[PDB]
Amino acid sequence: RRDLLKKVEIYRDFQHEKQGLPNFVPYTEKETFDQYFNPFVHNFEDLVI
Amino acid sequence: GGLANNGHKVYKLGRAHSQRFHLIRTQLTQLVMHERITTTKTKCKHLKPYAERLLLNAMRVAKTNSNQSRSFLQSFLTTSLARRKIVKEIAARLGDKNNNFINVRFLSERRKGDKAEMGYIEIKGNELENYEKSLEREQIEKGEVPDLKAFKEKVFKQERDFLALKLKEAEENINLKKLEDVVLLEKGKIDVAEFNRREKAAAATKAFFESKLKQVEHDLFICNKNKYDLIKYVTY
């Protein structure tokens, strides 16, 4: 076991420090639901009062 | 330097008070008749204080017969010989000394039976302490003995004379190589970049032979250093 667990590495950040390998892109975006409750997003000719 | 009993050290020796003070008086009456005893290391090192006081109160008696001192003299000595011995035979031999009358020196060997340390008291101007010192003198002068302090001074002095002529051959070779390499060859036909590595590396040779010439001379002062001198600190 110990020989195996000697070969494991953990990080808190979104990176690893190794080089020559890839990194997961983080997902920071957050969906703007603005098109549902806002006329300023739409064009005025599509709308109606 | 013991905090317990007034700064002094104490040896129980498996003996209580009266059983110990009989040991003192016997050894001290023996330490004047024969003026040399071979014992263990602790019996030889338990008795130095009692004796160093024992002789003052004999030396005082010679100069000034004092009731206070002769009373000390009757207590620790049993016989009448030993009482009359040191006042006239010992105390006349010492000649106005107060400080230290007595030596204690240990031994490298141990007994055959018990394998115990050993050591001997001697009153300081004993005959055997003089005879033994004449032999060491005579053999070192004339016989089978090295006389190291000549061999040591010899070797640092052959060394000192040997470093200098390597220093002399350095200042020469620096100059001859410098004047050649700075004058004739800066005209061309060289790399002047390495010109720093010429002097910079050669001068280190001088510094080497010069830094070692400190060690040897310090190794000679220290061989000719009197007791009543200071300490000589050294570069590094």
Binding site: - | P146, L148, V155, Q158, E159, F162
Partner: protein, 156 residues
């Protein structure tokens, strides 16, 4: 304690034990050295191979006890075989030039150097046998001279 040591070094290593058992041994190595002289060897080259031990005989008796009991006490003897080998002179210097000379070989060389009042020049020559620090140079100088050649190949 005495294994892979020079023979005269063993006695030095052995007088510091302060026992009967020590002295019983040194009477045996001093025998074996006497045989080697008799056999025309170079005692300056005489290392140790093995000191072998074994029981010989037991003499019983009685050690009494309380309440009529008794035990059996055995005084006993032993045997001491000793073996030595003189290294060839060539193998003795395969070691020194690496820096593993026996101290006893230097104690003699130091004691020789003083009896005849030697000079400074004789010491710089014989400094690779003469002290530990001087014998640490030789283990280091020697590591440098091989490496100069290792680099002479590594270029290619």
């Amino acid at each position: 304690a005495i294994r892979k040591q020079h023979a005269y070094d063993a006695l030095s290593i052995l007088s510091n034990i302060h026992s009967k058992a020590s002295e019983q041994i040194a009477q045996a190595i001093a025998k074996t050295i006497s045989v080697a002289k008799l056999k025309e060897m170079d005692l300056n080259r005489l290392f140790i191979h093995g000191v072998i031990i074994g029981r010989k005989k037991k003499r019983m008796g009685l050690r009494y006890h309380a309440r009529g009991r008794f035990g059996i006490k055995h005084r006993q003897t032993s045997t001491i075989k000793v073996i030595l080998y003189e290294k060839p002179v060539k193998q003795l210097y395969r070691e020194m030039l690496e820096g593993k000379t026996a101290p006893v070989l230097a104690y003699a060389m130091r004691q020789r150097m003083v009896s005849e009042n030697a000079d400074y020049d004789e010491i710089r020559e014989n400094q690779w046998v003469l002290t530990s620090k001087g014998r640490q140079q030789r283990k280091l100088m020697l590591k440098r001279k091989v490496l100069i050649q290792y680099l002479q190949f590594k270029a290619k």
